[PDB]
Amino acid sequence: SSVSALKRLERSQWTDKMDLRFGFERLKEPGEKTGWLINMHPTEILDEDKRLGSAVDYYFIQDDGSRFKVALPYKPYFYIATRKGCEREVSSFLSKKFQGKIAKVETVPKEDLDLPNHLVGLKRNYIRLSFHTVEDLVKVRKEISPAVKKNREQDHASADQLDNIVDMREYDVPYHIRLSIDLKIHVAHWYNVRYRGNAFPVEITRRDDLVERPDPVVLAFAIATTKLPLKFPDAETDQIMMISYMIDGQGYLITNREIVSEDIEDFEFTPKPEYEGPFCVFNEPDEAHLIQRWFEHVQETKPTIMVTYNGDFFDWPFVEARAAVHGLSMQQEIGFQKDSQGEYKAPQCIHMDCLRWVKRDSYLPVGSHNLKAAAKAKLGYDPVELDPEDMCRMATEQPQTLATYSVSDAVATYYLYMKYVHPFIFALCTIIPMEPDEVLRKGSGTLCEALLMVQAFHANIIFPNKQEQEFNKLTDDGHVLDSETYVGGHVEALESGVFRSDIPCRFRMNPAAFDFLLQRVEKTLRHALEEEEKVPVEQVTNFEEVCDEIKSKLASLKDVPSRIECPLIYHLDVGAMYPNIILTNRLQPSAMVDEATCAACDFNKPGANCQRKMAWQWRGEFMPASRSEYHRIQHQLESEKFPPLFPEGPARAFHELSREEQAKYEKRRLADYCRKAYKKIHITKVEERLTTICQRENSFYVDTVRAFRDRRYEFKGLHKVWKKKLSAAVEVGDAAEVKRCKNMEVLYDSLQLAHKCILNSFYGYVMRKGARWYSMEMAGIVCFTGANIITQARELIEQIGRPLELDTDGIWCVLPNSFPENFVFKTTNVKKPKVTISYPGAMLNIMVKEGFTNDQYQELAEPSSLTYVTRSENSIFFEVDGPYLAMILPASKEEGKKLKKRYAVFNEDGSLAELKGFEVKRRGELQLIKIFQSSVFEAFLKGSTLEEVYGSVAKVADYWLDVLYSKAANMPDSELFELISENRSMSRKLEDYGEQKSTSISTAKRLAEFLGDQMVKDAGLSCRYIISRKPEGSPVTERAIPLAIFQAEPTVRKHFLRKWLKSSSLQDFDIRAILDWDYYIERLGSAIQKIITIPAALQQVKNPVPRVKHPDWLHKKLLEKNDVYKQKKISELFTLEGRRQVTMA
Amino acid sequence: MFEARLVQGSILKKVLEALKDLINEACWDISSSGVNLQSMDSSHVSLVQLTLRSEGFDTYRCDRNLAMGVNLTSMSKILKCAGNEDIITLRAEDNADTLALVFEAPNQEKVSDYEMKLMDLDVEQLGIPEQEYSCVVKMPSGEFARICRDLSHIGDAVVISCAKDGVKFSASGELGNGNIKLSQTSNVDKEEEAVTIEMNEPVQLTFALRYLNFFTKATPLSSTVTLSMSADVPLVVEYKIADMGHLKYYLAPKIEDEEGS
Amino acid sequence: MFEARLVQGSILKKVLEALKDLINEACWDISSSGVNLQSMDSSHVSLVQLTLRSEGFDTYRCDRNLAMGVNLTSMSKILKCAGNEDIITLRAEDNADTLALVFEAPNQEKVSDYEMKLMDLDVEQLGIPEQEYSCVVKMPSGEFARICRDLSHIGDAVVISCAKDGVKFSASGELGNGNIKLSQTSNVDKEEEAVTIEMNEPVQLTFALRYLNFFTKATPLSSTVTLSMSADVPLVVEYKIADMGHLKYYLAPKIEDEEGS
Amino acid sequence: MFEARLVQGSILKKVLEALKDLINEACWDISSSGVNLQSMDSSHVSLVQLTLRSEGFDTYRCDRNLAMGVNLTSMSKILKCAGNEDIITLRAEDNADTLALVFEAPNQEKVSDYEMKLMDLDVEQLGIPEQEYSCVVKMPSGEFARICRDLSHIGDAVVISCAKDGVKFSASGELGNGNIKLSQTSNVDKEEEAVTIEMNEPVQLTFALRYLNFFTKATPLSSTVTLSMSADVPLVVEYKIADMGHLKYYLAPKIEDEEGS
DNA sequence: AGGTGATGCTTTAGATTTTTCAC
DNA sequence: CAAAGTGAAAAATCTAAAGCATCACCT
Ligand code: SF4
């Protein structure tokens, strides 16, 4: 009560004095000041009326660096809708029960989206309860959540106004977001701020024209930690060496000299002409002198940005442990406190981590998310490394190595942040009104959620409640569903193997399809001109010339359709294909309308220019239980009691249990009943359903992403324009013009990269529970439209080439050499003197608009007269990335089925453009297979005949398999240890799983026998192990010999391995003699068969190597096709009679 | 109003089960000559032929020249419901929806009826070329079927020769080669066990071992087996089921494609 | 302590082979009269009631009527050592820790001892209602198991139609439908193949096939099984051997899904 | 010319069938004295032996000695060709890269010739430890196989013990433990069912069971087995083949830790 | 020495479950 | 009291569904 109030007050005052310690003054004098935001944070500041007043704070700087802040209070609120005629009394009783919490009660109608009579002009009326603090909000929402839960429970089943309220909303999304959208505040932009007394709220305005913006103070500290061998690295055991850090180009370093042997001097790291960071050395005799010198250095810094990767798991608990050993108070010193979900939020500073962007939102290879790999990707040059096992002695022998390593790592960290992550924060501060930490941490799906809130309040529509997952789904026959999904990613690879463009291959074409192209060559080119660049034909000068060139080349392909010629690897990529199709058909989540509610609309004219007959298939994975036996088992459940979930509580009854344990009871009982009853518990079928979609709603998602795609195109166009301007100014050399033009081009690059990320985020919103617009058909219908497109491409290129991979949004493919691919059209127009046109994308575009010109595109031209102007639009634009030199396609082990979504490509120079889906980018598991993957990916690019390429891959495979077939006697054992180190995590304790059998549980049992239960007392253990072979007649999960046994002294270590081995006869116990090759050999065999053997066998290569065997299903067909005794059709030997059809009896 | 009953239900059981692993939808037809089956595999290789005499049935009332194309897996599953020594009758109508089969036992108590739904498909029909074939053997059924079963795993391709010495079947694979040689029989009175040959010209051909393996499940249909073949000619192996009718079978051979010289 | 020993090794062997898969756990509540095996089935619909009396044994000594019980799987695994006429011998104590299973040869040479860890259960005692049965049939075991296997691969819901003449089973399968006809047998000499029917009222109940297939695993018990039922009551299957006891098999009737009307 | 004539057919194919799961590749020193088998097993924990000398054969021509090698699974699948009554002959040559096998039917019209592309081997040969054997169990191997497979269902390993009271075949399992006891036959007139254990000293030793089961796959060639053994030596489970030859299997003792904790 | 089916002994394809990746 | 997962791999292990090699009568 009052103790909580004074606790919150003293917390507020502590945070306030803490905040003013680091600059950011309390702006309390009247006046108007220019401002440029960096971060936001909520707090409590006492009001003019003595009430504990919750607020938020905005942190602004200027060009000089004037660090100040302003407090923003607003009443917390949420909306409630009841039945019709139950809003006034609800407001009255809520006002008279929530006094001291609610400031005022107001009726704010908001526009529904999921409602019958959809946007006929009816607006649902909500009630809005303006509270005081977020803590009162929490206690009120906990008071109301089971009340509204039971209210909707009788609503499902079928007085007081507490029952009439039937919805709570925006409860998952906290106060930051709705205050951010309430005042239209968009972060990190130039705003004008004016304080006019405490009696009036501080007013903030958006200044729009000032796109020029400064650089805030940054910190890029570079950590290093000595770790004892066979130990988790921690601050309590060992001690720090030094620190170096970078500020806006200028860097420093602070170095503890008690363990550092020698003093150090200034370093420079300039590997690039536009890269430069100067340093300065501060050397500290004491580790306390280290930590203080760093802390007063950041005291004088007035710091706002302090970024190092993976801070919230290895640096901030580390540093607070360091301060706790010395007794230093971190909360007073800075304020770095553990978050409720395992981070260290800074109320005065900003701490990022690139692992929240290089691993997730950079769309790079996942396993190459390390900072050296990030540098080799983006900077292009990998910095120096160290082994954490032996870096303690490396530090003690020489400190200059760690000094150069840390300064290089820090300056690379700054360059990675500046070139990519400041664009990202500006990118996401453009319109998404979020503070950057939860921008990085929360997903791009939540970013799309944020955009939905932004344009929803611009639409002034209500936010849908984030739905809960409901079990016991019942179909039309009331049939129990197990798990629901779609038809899935229609991902198929037709052929497989090596495909290098310069190395020639075989083509077998159809001249009929070539003539089919020929009658519409000119129509293709015309549609390419007037619809891509909106450029008419009459401006084009040499249209006839390129037309005749196309005729000549296509006839030069047409005359001999079966040839051996150099492949042309072209990717039929269509990025943002999803919202393109939603643009074509105006696909809205609550325009998702069934016919029984399509008739509820007022546009069901016989001239059906508004109903789209969209078809889709529903996958059904369901329980065989019927309605009747479900009734019997539910009556048997509710007839008696249950064991209590309450420890030593009353007997547990059905009618007051919660939902999930009842679902568990139901699934177990039906599962084993049908296991003994129906032979299967999961039955797979793919039905078909037909459901149209409406078109005339607010279309906020549709027109929002259309506006975003137009902004994409114009931002990219201005990106080329201003980068040409920047280059020309570089040959000019005037400093002001070049610096403002770099500002403009990084602005445009920021925007385009932003909206590339968001178009990569649109599709993923709907297959996740607890969202605004969960769907079961939206992504389904769009992937069916895309499936139709890619199938039609597969027959089309099936006539005119070879389709390699049918991957959702991109179709990797190959073309003949003389195929028309790109043509430049010289025009008389001054603005575009020459127009470059890619032929295959153009002809696919005319195909997809011949099949898919949506004539139902209707726009609300006049909202007053409800005018819906029907028109026809085309937008289905494809693209082909630069011709790829290489194309590799792996296959699978089993019969007739290959890998899906797994492949790799290479540019003309052979750069690592794209590689994904393999274990080599998968963390954990086995690592030696990862390193053979790395070696063979390096060895792919050599060669000019595919036989010699396969021979070189065979040579590197022969090397790395004769490494292990020679038992590695003449080579050391540590890298062997890290190669064979198989690690499987303990998600629960050893005693939790119990009777479950796995290699992890067996390893935990071996640890329990070795060092007692103290090593296996909890979960999260990095249980490292290998596999043993000497034990015979034993399951492979059994005998999971751990690596932790190696710490024991040789008599006890031997005795334990006799105990686990059940054989005391052995006397020499080398680790090579305790291996079990069989799991290693089967792992490498599966990998090799997936990567090289099966695709080469498919590519008429006699073997990759005689050291691998093959599944014998392909062996039969190869040995029969290697002989002249082919199969014979009936018709040539046997005469025919005619086709006969059987009729109904 | 079509009726056809046969006393030897067992021979019907075995003939309808021994057509399984090459065809899923047979082409059964009913005419004045009896009931006849001609069906060709889904993998466009081989043809099977079955004919039955009208008098082979105890009663055979063919009211119309009706052909029925029905599935085979469920046909044999509902077929195996019958016991070994039980009488079988087949019923069909000028217009209906479902084939009718009634199973009756000699103890006149274990009597069962069944209702099999009819389906509709369009199928190809192939002509039968009849010409003078080089060699006709009169081989015991169990011995030839045993040869088919045992030579199944020496390889997947079998070559077959006929001579004055007799008949030889030679097959080989990656592991090795095996050949079986048959002489002629004169010192035995039981012609079912006896083997006799005729010859017109030398025969050195080869056939699909695997399809003969899947077909050879018709062993006890006839006590002996007779064959007939020539070069680039249909293989005619036929199983004469007494005066009931006969089974026949047609196979695609292998021809040696010419090479450069 | 507890002691019993009997010479017929086949009887309990096939009893355990019948009861091994249908029920996992049962309570062995021995008394002065003997033991009674009722089991709360994991299916929770098909109840079982086994009775065992003491006159059939050669020795039967016990000190206290223990309400013990063990898993039937381990019992099947340990009596799988038993043959046909090997003398079965069992020893036990007043406390439930380890049983002794002894098998003695008919030719007095082979002996054995086996030990098993016991377990403690808590199963409430189900009632075994006794009533008059409107229809009873003494069904010979072999062809009843045959018709269960007959409709097993064909249908998943067998109807029973017990009439004055006999009983009729039909079903509705994906491939089709059919029926089997039963009646009294009068002229048959062997009564184990004879079938007789008690009737008071025709009872129509639809039933799962392969559950009865689990129950028909008791076919080597006797050549003839007793099958009894009435209206609106679970059916009872009665198996009888020697003067040993009786097994009652209480299977609840699944009604027609009435949601369609 | 490495010739061998012999009347029987079932015995050779079944003794090579006996090695289907224990040896995939072995050594056959085809000598003038005969042919012999001796190798490690696949897991290299046991010794196998098959002896087959010249005077068993009808005619047996062999000038030099050649130690050939063949995949046991391959020729085992090949040796399932002729019947058990078939009379068998095998020969080889100086360049015997392939075997030359003929199956000839008893009625002398169905003759088949077989060949197999061979492969060489290099597995070290060791001398069998020959010494006095303390205990031998001359008991019919069918019962031995039955009981060992029966206890294999409950037990994983065995404890052999032949003391002055009799033979104890103990077997501890995770579910339960069991032991097998047998004494001398006294009232059995026939000596093929009799057990006669010559008695030297009591023994308690441990061996494997699944390898013993693999050895007991080879019963139907002999009526009885000798289980020859001493203290701390591998078991000698000897099967008499015929007058043709014999065979020995040597299973290693399980070295349990005799020391205390 | 074969003809009807039991009866069991391998064999092979799903079934199921648990981490652990990509989206 | 808390917590953004679910298809796909891949195997371990647990299964059942058959394929096929011996037996209960009978001259
Ligand atoms: S498709 Fe047309 S008729 Fe149907 S709901 Fe939408 S606007 Fe109304």
Author numbering:
A (entry chain A): 27 to 184, 212 to 1198
B (entry chain D), C (entry chain B), D (entry chain C): 1 to 261
Quoted from the paper:
In eukaryotes, the leading strand DNA is synthesized by Polε and the lagging strand by Polδ. These replicative polymerases have higher processivity when paired with the DNA clamp PCNA. Here we report two cryo-EM structures of human Polε–PCNA–DNA complex, one in an incoming nucleotide bound state and the other in a nucleotide exchange state. The structures reveal an unexpected three-point interface between the Polε catalytic domain and PCNA, with the conserved PIP (PCNA interacting peptide)-motif, the unique P-domain, and the thumb domain each interacting with a different protomer of the PCNA trimer.
In contrast, the ternary Polε–PCNA–DNA structure lacks the incoming dTTP and the finger domain is in an open position. We refer to this structure as the “nucleotide exchange state” because the Pol is open and poised to bind a new dNTP. The nucleotide exchange state is transient and dynamic, likely accounting for the medium resolution (5.01 Å) of the EM map. The ternary complex model was derived by rigidly-body fitting the quaternary model into the medium-resolution cryo-EM map.
